[PDB]
Design a binder for this molecule. Sequence first.
Ligand SMILES: O=C1Cc2cc(Nc3cc(Cl)ncc3Cl)ccc2N1
Ligand SMILES: O=C1Cc2cc(Nc3cc(Cl)ncc3Cl)ccc2N1
Ligand SMILES: [Cl-]
Ligand SMILES: [Cl-]
Lengths: 122, 122, 4, 4
Amino acid sequence: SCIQFTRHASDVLLNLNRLRSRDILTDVVIVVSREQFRAHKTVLMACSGLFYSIFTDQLKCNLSVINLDPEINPEGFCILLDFMYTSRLNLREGNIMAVMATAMYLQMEHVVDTCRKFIKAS
Amino acid sequence: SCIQFTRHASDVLLNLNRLRSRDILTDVVIVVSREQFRAHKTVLMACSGLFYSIFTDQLKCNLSVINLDPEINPEGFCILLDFMYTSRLNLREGNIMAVMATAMYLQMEHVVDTCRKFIKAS
Amino acid sequence: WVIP
Amino acid sequence: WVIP
Ligand SMILES: O=C1Cc2cc(Nc3cc(Cl)ncc3Cl)ccc2N1
Ligand SMILES: O=C1Cc2cc(Nc3cc(Cl)ncc3Cl)ccc2N1
Ligand SMILES: [Cl-]
Ligand SMILES: [Cl-]
């Protein structure tokens, strides 16, 4: 018999993104080639099958630095990290291949699905 | 020119609640009288003006235990912690007064607003 | 607020 | 997915 506040989840994600922009309570650095991205482990796990697996591992859960596979493109990662914290995906002709490959590696099934749809259309 | 995934924020909150239920990456214990509640500091901050203030404080941000005011009712807190992680509020005739008082203390303005509306109706 |  |  609960009542529900429609905008609650969106408002929570918006505040988590504000904490990220101000580098508040970030507890991990994701290294992608020469580039570094600060984030919250819980948000990464909630969005990605790969980070979920990494941070539930009894040894990796305690790492402050995670290095991604050298094939991962920093821009594709940046676009996906922004999507994790906003629900908005900056999908463009020039980045779609790198975004799909990064989403497949990160195990972000809904992003992979829309990339496959957008590629098929063109 | 971004695209948006409508269910993303809700899916993120659902996974954060699953992490809470399994006690994964919880980094704080909230003590309310004899009762203890494990949670994620970032989620508490995203939902509550009080926790936002506590965990942005250069000294309190590092505490693993937070003790609430002894007037706070553990059931009212439990109902509000559930709302933080689900968007669902278990508001009942028998708990509305304790929920409103706890929401005022935690600075959860939308919960305070619905409690004032439900009380006014009766 | 809604009835979910 | 939608146009926001
Ligand atoms: O495409 C995706 C997105 C995703 C997210 C998560 N994260 C969780 C899943 C569960 Cl069941 N509980 C808690 C968490 Cl944080 C796992 C796999 C995938 N695949
Ligand atoms: O009723 C409420 C809910 C709430 C949440 C937060 N938390 C934040 C606010 C901002 Cl601007 N950036 C980041 C965070 Cl985590 C503060 C005050 C209140 N009042
Ligand atoms: Cl996804
Ligand atoms: Cl609220």
